[PDB]
Amino acid sequence: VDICTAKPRDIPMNPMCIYRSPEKTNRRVWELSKANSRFATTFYQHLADSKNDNDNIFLSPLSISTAFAMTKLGACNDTLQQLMEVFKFDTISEKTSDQIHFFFAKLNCRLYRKAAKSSKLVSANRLFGDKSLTFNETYQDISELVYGAKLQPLDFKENAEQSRAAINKWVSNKTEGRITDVIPSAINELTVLVLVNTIYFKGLWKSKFSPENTRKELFYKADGESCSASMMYQEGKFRYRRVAEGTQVLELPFKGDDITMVLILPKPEKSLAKVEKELTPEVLQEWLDELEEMMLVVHMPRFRIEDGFSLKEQLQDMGLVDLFSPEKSKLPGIVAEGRDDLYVSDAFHKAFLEVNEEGAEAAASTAVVIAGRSLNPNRVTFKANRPFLVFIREVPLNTIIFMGRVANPCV
Ligand SMILES: *[C@@H]1O[C@H](CO)[C@@H](O[C@@H]2O[C@H](CO)[C@@H](O[C@H]3O[C@H](CO)[C@@H](O)[C@H](O)[C@@H]3O)[C@H](O)[C@H]2NC(C)=O)[C@H](O)[C@H]1NC(C)=O
Ligand SMILES: *[C@@H]1O[C@H](CO)[C@@H](O[C@@H]2O[C@H](CO)[C@@H](O)[C@H](O)[C@H]2NC(C)=O)[C@H](O)[C@H]1NC(C)=O
Ligand SMILES: *[C@@H]1O[C@H](CO)[C@@H](O)[C@H](O)[C@H]1NC(C)=O
Predict the structure, then answer these.
(1) How would you class 172 by CB atoms within 10 Å of its CB: exposed for 0-12, middle for 13-18, buried for 19 or more?
(2) Residue 126 annotated as lining a ligand binding site
(3) Which has the closest alpha carbon to 58: 406, 410, 408, 409?
(4) Which regions form coiled coils?
(5) Options 1.10.8.60, 2.30.39.10, 1.10.8.100, 3.20.10.10; which CATH number does 205-300+363-410 get?
(6) CA 126 – ligand 3 centroid, Å
(7) Whose Cα sits closest to atom 12 in ligand 3?
(8) Beta bridge partners of 295
(9) Which CATH entry fits the domain spanning 5-204+301-357: 1.10.10.10, 3.30.497.10, 3.40.50.300, 3.30.160.670?
(10) Atom 4 (ligand 2): residue with closest C-alpha?
C-alpha cells in the first residue's frame, strides 16, 4: 500500500490505546487543518508572549504538530490524552484518536508528493532512540507510511556526542545545509528518546522584485529607535485588505499559487504585540476571505530568520507533561529490555527563512521591465517599515506551514 492510496483501515486501531473527545460557507477546510491552525495560534501566542518585541520569531507549527502526531502513535492513557488535548486534535468533532493519523496521511500525501513544481517542501521529523530500543513492529509500519519517518537507533549511552553530530548531519543534509545545528552543543548517556523535526521550503515569487529597486530605507523597531534595512520594492495585483484597527493583510503567492506568504502589517499607531494577542484561527480565516485582488505598491524588506529551540519546556507549560516524565510517560509503542520507563528526553525544532527579490531562499537575479503601465495616483501602498507578522500557508489545504514575526530585518 501507498501513502496516497492508504485507506482508513490501513491505520490499525488497537482498543488498549484509544481516546474519545466529547462533542461540542465557501469551500471545504479539513478538520485536521483547523485543529492544526488552532495549535499554531495557541502555541505562537505563547512563544511570542515570552519574547521581547524586538526579537524575530520563526517556527513551523505544522512540523511540530506532525512530529507529535507521529509520537502519539505509541502513546497511551494520560500520555495519549494530553497529546490530543494540547495539539487540539480533540477539537475534531467527535472522531477517535486513530483517525487523526488517517488525516495526516491524507494531508502529508498532498504536501509532499514528488510531482515536482517550483516550490519545494521537504519534511524532517524523525525520532532518535538508543540502540537498546526496539520500536514496536506495527508502530513502525504506520510511523513510516503516514509520516515517512524512521525510528533511527543510535548510541547515546556509549559515545553520545558522536550521535548528536549524526543527527545534525542528517537534518543539515535534508535542509540543504541551511539548518546544521538542530541539537545544540544537550545529549548524553541520560538520553533515551529524541524527537527532531523541521520543514524546509524554497520557492520563487510568482511576482519577483527587481534588485534594481532595493534601496536602504528605514525600519522602526519597537523600542522606538530605528535602523537600516534592505527594502525591496514593486507594484502589481495582489490579494489585499486593510482590516480592523487599520491592519494591512497581504498575500504574496509563490510560483504555483498553492503556497503563499501572508504578511500582517498593523498601522503605525498599533503595536504588533496587540495584534499577536488577538490572533485566532477564526480571525485569521476571516481576513484571508476578505483579501481582494488589487493594484498596489509593495515595500517589504529583505530578511533572514533562523529561529530554533527545545520544545519540552514550553510544551509542558502548555499541558504536555507525562510524555516527558520518566515515571508518568506511557509509550507502549517503544520497548527496551528491562526498561519499562520510556519517556522523551527532549524535542528540538529549527526553522529557517531567507527572503529576497527572488523568493524563498532562491537567489538568482531577475531584472524587470514594465512597458506602458499607469496606476491610479490614488493607490494603496504597503510599506512594511515597522514590525510585522509572517505566514507561509498551503492554500489548497488551508494549512499554516510557517509563522513568525520579522521585528528586526536590520543588518
Ligand atoms: C491504560 O489504559 C488501558 C486501556 O485504556 C487500561 O487497560 C484496561 O485494563 C483493565 C484492567 O487491567 C481492563 O479491564 C478488565 O481487564 C480484563 C479483561 O481482559 C479483566 O479480566 C479485568 O477484570 C478488568 O475488569 C480494561 O478492559 C483495559 N482497557 C480498557 C478497555 O479500559 C490500562 O490498565 C491503563 N493503565 C495504564 C496506565 O497503562
Ligand atoms: C543525504 O546524504 C545522502 C548521501 O550521504 C544523499 O543521498 C544521495 O543524494 C544524491 C544527490 O545528492 C542522489 O542522487 C542519490 O539518489 C541519494 N542517494 C540516496 C541514499 O537516496 C542525500 O541526497 C542527502 N540528503 C537528501 C537530499 O536526502
Ligand atoms: C505492537 O504493540 C501493540 C501494543 O502497543 C500490539 O497491539 C501490536 O500487536 C504490536 N505489533 C506487533 C505485531 O509487533
Answers:
(1) middle
(2) yes
(3) 406
(4) none
(5) 2.30.39.10
(6) 20
(7) 137
(8) 237
(9) 3.30.497.10
(10) 173
